[PDB]
Amino acid sequence: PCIEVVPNITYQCMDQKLSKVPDDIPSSTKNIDLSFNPLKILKSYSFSNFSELQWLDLSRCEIETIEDKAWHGLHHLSNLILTGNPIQSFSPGSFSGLTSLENLVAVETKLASLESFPIGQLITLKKLNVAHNFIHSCKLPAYFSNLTNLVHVDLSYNYIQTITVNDLQFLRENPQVNLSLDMSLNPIDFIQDQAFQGIKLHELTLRGNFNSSNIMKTCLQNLAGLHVHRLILGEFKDERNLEIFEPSIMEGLCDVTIDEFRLTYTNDFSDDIVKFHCLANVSAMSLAGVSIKYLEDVPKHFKWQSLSIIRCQLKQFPTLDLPFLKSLTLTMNKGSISFKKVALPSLSYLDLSRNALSFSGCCSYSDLGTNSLRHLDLSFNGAIIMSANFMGLEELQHLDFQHSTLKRVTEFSAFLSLEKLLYLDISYTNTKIDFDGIFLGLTSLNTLKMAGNSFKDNTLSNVFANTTNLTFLDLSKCQLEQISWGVFDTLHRLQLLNMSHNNLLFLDSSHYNQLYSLKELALDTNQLKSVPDGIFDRLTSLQKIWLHTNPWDCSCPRIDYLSRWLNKNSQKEQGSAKCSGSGKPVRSIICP
Amino acid sequence: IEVVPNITYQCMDQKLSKVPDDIPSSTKNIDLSFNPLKILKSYSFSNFSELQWLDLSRCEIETIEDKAWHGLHHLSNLILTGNPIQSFSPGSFSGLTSLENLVAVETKLASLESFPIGQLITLKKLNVAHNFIHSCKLPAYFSNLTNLVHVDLSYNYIQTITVNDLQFLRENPQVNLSLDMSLNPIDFIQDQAFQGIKLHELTLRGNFNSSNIMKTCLQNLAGLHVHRLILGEFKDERNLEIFEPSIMEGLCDVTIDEFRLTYTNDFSDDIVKFHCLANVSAMSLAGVSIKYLEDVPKHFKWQSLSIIRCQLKQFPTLDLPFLKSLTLTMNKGSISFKKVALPSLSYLDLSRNALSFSGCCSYSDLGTNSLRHLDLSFNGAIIMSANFMGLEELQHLDFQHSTLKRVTEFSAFLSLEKLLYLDISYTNTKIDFDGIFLGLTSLNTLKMAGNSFKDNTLSNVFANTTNLTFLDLSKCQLEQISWGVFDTLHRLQLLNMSHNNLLFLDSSHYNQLYSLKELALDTNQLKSVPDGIFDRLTSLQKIWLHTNPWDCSCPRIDYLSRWLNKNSQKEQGSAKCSGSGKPVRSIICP
Amino acid sequence: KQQWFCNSSDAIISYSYCDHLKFPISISSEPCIRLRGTNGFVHVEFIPRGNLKYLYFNLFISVNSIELPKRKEVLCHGHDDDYSFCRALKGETVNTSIPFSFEGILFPKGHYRCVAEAIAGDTEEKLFCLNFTIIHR
Amino acid sequence: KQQWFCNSSDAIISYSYCDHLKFPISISSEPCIRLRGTNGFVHVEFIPRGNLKYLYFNLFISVNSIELPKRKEVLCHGHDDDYSFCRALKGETVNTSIPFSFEGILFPKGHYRCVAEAIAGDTEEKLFCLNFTIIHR
Ligand SMILES: CCCCCCCCCCC[C@@H](O)CC(=O)N[C@H]1[C@@H](OP(=O)(O)O)O[C@H](CO)[C@@H](O)[C@@H]1OC(=O)C[C@H](O)CCCCCCCCCCC
Ligand SMILES: CCCCCCCCCCC[C@@H](O)CC(=O)N[C@H]1[C@@H](OP(=O)(O)O)O[C@H](CO)[C@@H](O)[C@@H]1OC(=O)C[C@H](O)CCCCCCCCCCC
Ligand SMILES: *[C@@H]1O[C@H](CO)[C@@H](O[C@@H]2O[C@H](CO)[C@@H](O)[C@H](O)[C@H]2NC(C)=O)[C@H](O)[C@H]1NC(C)=O
Ligand SMILES: *[C@@H]1O[C@H](CO)[C@@H](O[C@@H]2O[C@H](CO)[C@@H](O)[C@H](O)[C@H]2NC(C)=O)[C@H](O)[C@H]1NC(C)=O
Ligand SMILES: *[C@@H]1O[C@H](CO)[C@@H](O[C@H]2O[C@H](CO)[C@@H](O)[C@H](O)[C@H]2NC(C)=O)[C@H](O)[C@H]1NC(C)=O
Ligand SMILES: *[C@@H]1O[C@H](CO)[C@@H](O[C@H]2O[C@H](CO)[C@@H](O)[C@H](O)[C@H]2NC(C)=O)[C@H](O)[C@H]1NC(C)=O
Ligand SMILES: *[C@@H]1O[C@H](CO)[C@@H](O[C@H]2O[C@H](CO)[C@@H](O)[C@H](O)[C@H]2NC(C)=O)[C@H](O)[C@H]1NC(C)=O
Ligand SMILES: *[C@H]1O[C@H](CO)[C@@H](O[C@@H]2O[C@H](CO)[C@@H](O)[C@H](O)[C@H]2NC(C)=O)[C@H](O)[C@H]1NC(C)=O
Ligand SMILES: *[C@H]1O[C@H](CO)[C@@H](O[C@H]2O[C@H](CO)[C@@H](O)[C@H](O)[C@H]2NC(C)=O)[C@H](O)[C@H]1NC(C)=O
Ligand SMILES: *[C@@H]1O[C@H](CO)[C@@H](O)[C@H](O)[C@H]1NC(C)=O
Ligand SMILES: *[C@@H]1O[C@H](CO)[C@@H](O)[C@H](O)[C@H]1NC(C)=O
Ligand SMILES: *[C@@H]1O[C@H](CO)[C@@H](O)[C@H](O)[C@H]1NC(C)=O
Ligand SMILES: *[C@@H]1O[C@H](CO)[C@@H](O)[C@H](O)[C@H]1NC(C)=O
Ligand SMILES: *[C@H]1O[C@H](CO)[C@@H](O)[C@H](O)[C@H]1NC(C)=O
């Protein structure tokens, strides 16, 4: 029984209609997955001779009783997953011997409270998950004093309706305790005054708690005092959403102290919420799944240092003059918006990917208003028209255009001023390289990804002549039929060359003479019938080579160098080169 | 230099003393331009009688001596431009029995009054631009020339227009005439001078130095009826500093079917919303720095609007409920499409704007059910998301060179049952889905060059596209063709599969193509052909097989060398043998 | 082996389990889907064989034998997602019902298939696989 | 050969006629072009060997011997054109100063060549052809 995953190491007994734990398992096993077996009960010393288990998963095991002493041989076990088990009685120290336990997951374990929960010995704990249970107390037992390393707790989907100054009575005792709390999906109506006074919370998640405005409004006023790092706030498309939602509802956040705010989906939304006055002193404003439609007039004093808009619904591209902003991220937009000028002189990181965004007259200082941009991701978008070669942006190390429709890139040296650029991806941009100076300027370039494109006369021309420090080059799917002389003569630091998925008919030994530091060469799935003798002999750093899916002609004496060569080097060949007609491997063939 | 055998000759810049005797007596066009001549001799070419078109531009001529134009009994076009032949005595226009078009540009001429073209009743077009004329005055001999419909008065010294100048037109409201006043420094038009006059089109471009002067001059067009009026200026000329819309008032005393604005150094979006334009039937901007065009008043009686080479920053909003035709083309920007509501709209042209367009296309985009022509060529990303619910009257759809997205993800032309013509060439569409053209059952003309197919296999997409007479699959990287692919296309008259990478043909595709006239297969990678392949190509008129590496081994090249030799009149270009170079026509298997 | 059906102004939806993945789940619309346009709810009841943190779908649709290319559809992106069920862990109870709303495209008439493999992004392990059948008028 | 020349704060421009097309023109700029940026006039006096109704240009540019793809620039589209001279006819004297204006993109330094065939898209013949030489510093 059981599956074979990483033998004597990870196994999968999931859903093996098992009576109980099988001994027919290597003792060295470090990963078991018994979930979905009618075990019903955990007869003790069950996990005794599986002595170096790390990851135990007993989800949906129908278990009613932990006959304690069950976890004895497991000094080093970290993950224990008991989800969906009808355990009523967690009889004290039931978690016996689990000395190295970091992560405890007792979701839907029919649990009434932490009071009745025998976990005070497990100092090693960090994560505790008691979501989906029968809990009503926000309060944290006094034995957390003992659990030094506990850093996060998850009470979402319980029955907590109320938060008192006592529920929290404990964080006050140790305001040098880093804890994070998730209370999403708890039908909360009451937090009392001063409940959240002098409290130290890292991540507090309040999602889908409130049934209507007034409850939230008021519950929120009564967080006052709290210093929090990350407050996550919103509701859910599949639950009861506040029919109405006005910014007023976050009065008193102005008493709550936040560095990262994070708004999620909400039935009713108001563009005025992100302008809302109580968020001015966040250092990481952030939106997700939100139906915000415009984003203009964000007051200039605001101290947002990163902003991030994700899966939202902008109709038009933000107007932003925020001078303290270091990272903008607008991504997966519903729209097809079109880029508009900005002025964020503090900006260093711009990810505008996946918006079907359209960008006319890219790219220079004028467009952005910083001289310290290092990362421009314009990938998965629409028509990017290159009318400007990055004058002003010369601090850049990451340019991604992949899968967008770049236009005019071959009409001048469009990347001329990008002398510090380390990574360029123009793969899949429907670009046809008509011009050999396409890449002038890019003297620092390491990674060049330019698959899925094409070349004048299907010829790989001399476009790399001074992209000398190139270490990764992808020319896969570029319809190449051949390669002009000289092209690679300078790429001495090149390590990976991919020229697979092309239509090459021959190769020429005049290319590989100087790829001194090259370790990887894909030439698979072209149309080579053959290779010149000795072609690979000067590739002194070589490790892997792909050559399959070419119709190699195995007539001797022709196929001799290569057969011999691959046989000697079989270790390096990835996949398997084969003969036209016969279908036999190439390393197999022996000439007289 | 004869270009057409014995029927047109080009003698331009030949340092020629005078006309050559040498040249044939049949020649129908002749060009002696840029030759020193100085005198158009008497009877100078009596022999060249079967002559339609004569051009003597910049021939350095100073004298038309008497009866130079004999015989010339059929000459329609005559071009004397740039010759200093200053004085034309009642002895220069002899016997142009059939002259339609006379061109005296830069001939130093100073007046029409004394200009000797009196009984050339045939005349359709006179052009006297770039001369010394100081007077608008339209001679009375014009009564004798009832054929004349167009006079070019451009680049002359005219400052004034006076009621007697245009008297002739008052006493001839049956005459249909057109005037080009452009590049004259007109500062005064006398009151009532355009009362009871009709012009077909009048061109007033680059006339005015000063805002006020234009305003007053335009004032005194009052009462004019003009089919097409053309206004504005040029960039290589002294422009108007200010151009306030009010400078147009008193166009509402003139009557205009078609108004046409051109470049204007200074321009105001609200100039095209002027009230004195509301009754124009065809509004048209061209070369203008218009940036918005939004709140156009619904009473405006515009039936056609053409914006060309302008600078819109945003796609116009429009509710003009009698607009039948909208052309927005060559826009400076990239702009993105916004919905409109044009219920009279039947012809939309939005080509060449780098236009992007989320959620193409359906009724709610446009607000018409009568759209017969949609042209979205040469634009940006067009995101196909509806399939033309509401637009089912479409007969012509053009997507050429735009980047068409999602078109392979559903049947996106499903509702276009009336569609005759589809261009999806160079849209870089990679055809994944055989139902892509479902719905297009009326379709004749399918252009889809420069795309590609999954597995480079032409698959079965023409199953129900059955009235195709014209299919272009050139440049689609094809390597092979699925089996039944062409079996439905009983009406097909042209099939292009050139510039592809086919290595073999299968004969089953091409039998049954009985209706086919043209078949291009050149510039593939073919070496051979199934014996028989072309036999039932009964209607065939033209075949291209060249630029393929044909193997002229015998007995292999037998069928074809024979066939192509027998059908040598239909072969376009020449199918040559690999190695040698020898036409396949000419091989003879033993 | 149907596990459901429903009729409507145009559509006759229905689904069985996939021959190769029978893992249980139960699921229903409200109303029955009109392809012309529809607002409603999707009732889903089942207990997953893996975490739904990165839930997504693979749809293998086909009209009258014409395969559409594999369509992918993400539900849980694994960050601040819009659905409660995204937090579901392996072998947890899931009852929710999900609102949906759409105006129709003109779909060709006839016999549609669609297998919907659900998949857990974190592991690419298939969670389940339905096999719908839609007939349209 | 040198028909004209001028040098500016970053460029040194000059032209000749094209080896196999000598038809005359005298053209110049005021000011001399600075590649970094320039407002000025192109003065042009010549006699068209053709109608200018569809005047356009083919620019065969080449930076330090690297050829750019042929570039095409229409001046007269033959319809409501922006310039006086599109109206000019073969033979007619032409004299004009054409305003122009630009902001420099970054140009690599060195030796440019630009041959500029002028063409009359009515007959498609050649009007004239200059061979420029820009030397950027
Ligand atoms: C021939 C093969 C067809 C295969 C069909 C599947 C693929 C169809 C893809 C076309 C639709 C898609 O590209 C665009 C879309 O999604 N549009 C919705 C969007 O419309 P916009 O106008 O773009 O705002 O948002 C609008 C507002 O929300 C909304 O009105 C639009 O909704 C649509 O048009 C979606 C379609 O109508 C699809 C309907 C899905 C039917 C569900 C069947 C379920 C059967 C059971 C299987 C699990
Ligand atoms: C390796 C390089 C060799 C190739 C060089 C030639 C090709 C260069 C093409 C790049 C620019 C072009 O794609 C876009 C353009 O046209 N920009 C003008 C436009 O700018 P926006 O981006 O729209 O604001 O509109 C602006 C407002 O009018 C205007 O300022 C912008 O100006 C430019 O970008 C033009 C460039 O600076 C090019 C300058 C031409 C220099 C003239 C040479 C003189 C000698 C002539 C010899 C024939
Ligand atoms: C408090 O707790 C968290 C969680 O242990 C600490 O870790 C950072 O935050 C996230 C949790 O959301 C971790 O997963 C990251 O690895 C940590 N940050 C980064 C950038 O990796 C957090 O540092 C703790 N706070 C303090 C002051 O110790
Ligand atoms: C068939 O297709 C080709 C390629 O699209 C047509 O165009 C020929 O090749 C180039 C590329 O388009 C054009 O510039 C030429 O003008 C065309 N050839 C010639 C000889 O002029 C070709 O015309 C098409 N032929 C038919 C009959 O439709
Ligand atoms: C070289 O390029 C090929 C093609 O891009 C790479 O293969 C990858 O992309 C394929 C596209 O056909 C996909 O099938 C795969 O996701 C992936 N290949 C595999 C086996 O998974 C290939 O990774 C590249 N080779 C390298 C980097 O050595
Ligand atoms: C007046 O004469 C003009 C010039 O011949 C006629 O021609 C114009 O109008 C026609 C259609 O109405 C066009 O087909 C012609 O090409 C067009 N020519 C020009 C230069 O515009 C015109 O028809 C006559 N007037 C009317 C009202 O019909
Ligand atoms: C999904 O359901 C269809 C319908 O039962 C399965 O295909 C079967 O039905 C075909 C016509 O619809 C029959 O002709 C076939 O015999 C039968 N399929 C096979 C392989 O025999 C389909 O296989 C089901 N889903 C899967 C495989 O995921
Ligand atoms: C314009 O002039 C340049 C030189 O300034 C020409 O360049 C010469 O090209 C020909 C090729 O036949 C050679 O004779 C010379 O060696 C070249 N000289 C240099 C310095 O490169 C160019 O050919 C001219 N324009 C044309 C031919 O249109
Ligand atoms: C934002 O939080 C800051 C954090 O200290 C608060 O104080 C700042 O903003 C005040 C608004 O006028 C200024 O008076 C102070 O200069 C500044 N004070 C400090 C100590 O930094 C402020 O209460 C919060 N602002 C809002 C609008 O809620
Ligand atoms: C436009 O037409 C209406 C109705 O004929 C009329 O009241 C008005 O004078 C006209 N305006 C003009 C021609 O400017
Ligand atoms: C096209 O004809 C076939 C065979 O008659 C049919 O099955 C197919 O579905 C038709 N096209 C449609 C419905 O769009
Ligand atoms: C799921 O929700 C509906 C709402 O009434 C209910 O009928 C169904 O039985 C619910 N829950 C369970 C556990 O069955
Ligand atoms: C052409 O125009 C310039 C501009 O002032 C002038 O100096 C020059 O002499 C003119 N040439 C002729 C022949 O008029
Ligand atoms: C690459 O070109 C640069 C800049 O044009 C030039 O200096 C050099 O000749 C080339 N690189 C090298 C290493 O020679």
Residue A579: phi and psi, rounded to 5, are: -85, 140
Name the token pair of B388.
């033309």
**DSSP label at B517?**
-
Specify the amino acid at residue A289.
G
Helices (H), A199-262: 213-221
H or E stretch including B560? helix B558-566
d(CA A411, CA A434): 8
Q: Which member of C82, C83, C91 has the closest CB to residue A60?
A: C91
B90 by Cβ neighbours in 10 Å (0-12 / 13-18 / 19+) ranks as exposed
Residues 6+ apart with CB under 8 A from D73: D56, D57, D59
d(CA A322, CA A302): 7
The residue whose CB lies within 8 Å of the most ligand 9 atoms, and thus the one to mutate among A227, A255, A281, A303, is: A281
Pocket lining for ligand 4, CB < 6 angstroms: B 449, 474-475, 496, 498-499, 518, 520
Of A535, A526, A502, residue with least CA distance to A577: A526
Cis bond leading into A225, ω under 30°?
no
What is the greatest pairwise CA distance in chain B?
93
Of A485, A371, A458, residue with least CA distance to A417: A371
Name the token pair of B566.
């027998």
Name the token pair of A25.
């398992």
Of A322, A420, A330, A312, residue with least CA distance to A369: A322
Specify the amino acid at residue A282.
V
First-last CA distance in chain C: 24
Of B99, B63, B67, B98, residue with least CA distance to B84: B63
B1-590 to CATH, choices 3.40.50.2300, 3.80.10.10, 3.50.50.100, 3.30.479.10:
3.80.10.10
First-last CA distance in chain A: 51
d(CA A573, CA A545): 5
Method: X-ray
How do strand B373-375 and strand B396-398 relate by DSSP bridges? parallel
Residue D48 CA neighbour count, 13 Å, CB half: 23
**DSSP label at C34?**
P
Residues within 8 A of A (CB atoms), D 63-92 only: 63, 66-69, 71
**In the beta sheet, which residues pair with residue D67?**
D62
Name the token pair of B569.
């009149």
Closest-approach residue (CA) in chain C for A184: C84
d(CA D92, CA B201): 24
Of B290, B263, B265, B207, residue with least CA distance to B274: B290
The residue whose CB lies within 8 Å of the most ligand 4 atoms, and thus the one to mutate among B497, B498, B517, is: B498
d(CA B537, CA B181): 60
Atom nearest to A408 CA in ligand 2: 13
**In the beta sheet, which residues pair with residue C40?**
C100
Q: Which resolution in angstroms does this entry have?
A: 2.7
First-last CA distance in chain B: 47
Spell out where C32-124 has E strands. 37-46, 55-63, 66-67, 71-74, 94-103, 110-120
Of A305, A321, A307, A270, residue with least CA distance to A291: A270
Q: Does the Cβ of D45 fall within 6 Å of ligand 13?
A: yes
H or E stretch including A103? strand A103-105
d(CA B376, CA B352): 8
d(CA A409, CA D22): 34
Instruction: Classify A215 in phi/psi space as left (phi over 0), alpha (psi -120 to 50) or beta.
Output: alpha
**In the beta sheet, which residues pair with residue B84?**
none
d(CA B441, CA A67): 74
CB B510 within 8 A of CB B533: yes
d(CA B351, CA B375): 6
d(CA B229, CA B250): 14
Residue A436 CA neighbour count, 13 Å, CB half: 16
Cβ-based neighbour number of residue B479 at 10 Å = 16
3-state secondary structure B135-187: CCCCCHHHHCCCCCCEEECCCCCCCEECCCCCHHHHCCCCCCCCEECCCCCCC
Specify the amino acid at residue B311.
Q
**DSSP label at B271?**
G
Closest-approach residue (CA) in chain A for B332: A360
d(CA B415, CA B362): 10
DSSP letters along C26-56, please?
A: EEE-SSPPPTTEEEEEEEEEE--SS--TTEE
> To 10 degrees, the CA torsion angle through B361, B367, B372, B377?
-40
Q: Tell me which chain D residues have a C-beta less than 8 angstroms from the C-beta of B230.
A: 80
CB A409 within 8 A of CB A431: yes
Pocket lining for ligand 8, CB < 6 angstroms: D 16, 18-19, 115, 131, 133
d(CA A525, CA A476): 10
Per-residue buried b or exposed e for C67-94, using 16+ beta carbons within 10 Å of the residue's own CB: ebeeeeeebbbeebbbbbbbbbbbbbee
Q: Would you list the domain boundaries of chain C?
A: 1-137
| Residue whose tokens read 């028989």 | B532
| Residue whose tokens read 């960008």 | A359
Of A165, A136, A140, residue with least CA distance to A152: A140
Q: Tell me which chain D residues have a C-beta less than 8 angstroms from the C-beta of B154.
A: 87
How do strand A227-234 and strand A200-207 relate by DSSP bridges? parallel
Specify the amino acid at residue A83.
T
Angle A309-A310-A314 (CA atoms, 0-180°, nearest 5)?
65
Angle D53-D56-D62 (CA atoms, 0-180°, nearest 5)?
170
How many Cβ contacts (< 8 angstroms) between chains B and D?
68
How do strand A31-33 and strand B304-308 relate by DSSP bridges? unpaired
Residues 6+ apart with CB under 8 A from A537: none
Residue A527: phi and psi, rounded to 5, are: -130, 40
Instruction: Classify B343 in phi/psi space as left (phi over 0), alpha (psi -120 to 50) or beta.
Output: alpha
DSSP letters along A346-371, please?
A: T--EEE--SS--BEEEE-SHHHH--S
H helices then E strands: how many in chain C?
Answer: 0, 10
Residues 6+ apart with CB under 8 A from B49: B25, B71, B72, B73, B74
Angle B50-B51-B53 (CA atoms, 0-180°, nearest 5)?
165
Q: What is the whole-number distance in angstroms between the Cα of residue A214 and the centre of ligand 9?
A: 27
Please list the helix, strand and coil fractions of chain B in percent, rounded to the nearest 5, in that order.
10, 20, 70
How do strand B150-152 and strand A285-288 relate by DSSP bridges? unpaired
Q: What is the whole-number distance in angstroms between the Cα of residue A391 and the centre of ligand 2?
A: 13
3-state class (DSSP) for residue A279 = helix
Name the token pair of C103.
């105006």
d(CA A312, CA A307): 13
Q: Tell me which chain A residues have a C-beta less than 8 angstroms from the C-beta of C89.
A: 59, 81, 83, 105, 107, 129, 131
Closest chain B C-alpha to D66 CA, distance in angstroms? 28
Name the token pair of B219.
């004032």
> To 10 degrees, the CA torsion angle through A534, A537, A538, A544?
130
Name the token pair of B373.
């022509």
> To 10 degrees, the CA torsion angle through B139, B143, B148, B150?
40
CB B402 within 8 A of CB B374: no
CB A454 within 8 A of CB A429: no
CB A352 within 8 A of CB A377: yes
3-state class (DSSP) for residue A245 = coil
| Residue whose tokens read 């009621």 | B163
Class of domain C1-137: mainly beta
Closest chain A C-alpha to D71 CA, distance in angstroms? 8
d(CA B132, CA B117): 18
H or E stretch including B471? strand B470-472
Instruction: Classify A410 in phi/psi space as left (phi over 0), alpha (psi -120 to 50) or beta.
Output: alpha
**In the beta sheet, which residues pair with residue B530?**
none
**DSSP label at B21?**
S
Of A286, A221, A217, A219, residue with least CA distance to A245: A217
CB C133 within 8 A of CB C110: no
B541 by Cβ neighbours in 10 Å (0-12 / 13-18 / 19+) ranks as middle
Angle B385-B388-B394 (CA atoms, 0-180°, nearest 5)?
140
**Contact call for A360 and B428, based on CB within 8 A:** no
- B336 and A CB contact within 8 Å: yes
d(CA C33, CA C43): 13
H or E stretch including A483? strand A482-483
Pocket lining for ligand 9, CB < 6 angstroms: A 254, 277-278, 280-281
Class of domain A1-592: alpha beta
d(CA B142, CA C122): 89
Name the token pair of A500.
């697979």
- C1 and A CB contact within 8 Å: no
Specify the amino acid at residue A496.
L
Of D52, D49, D116, residue with least CA distance to D78: D52
d(CA B337, CA B326): 14
How do strand A405-407 and strand A383-386 relate by DSSP bridges? parallel
| Residue whose tokens read 């009866």 | B67
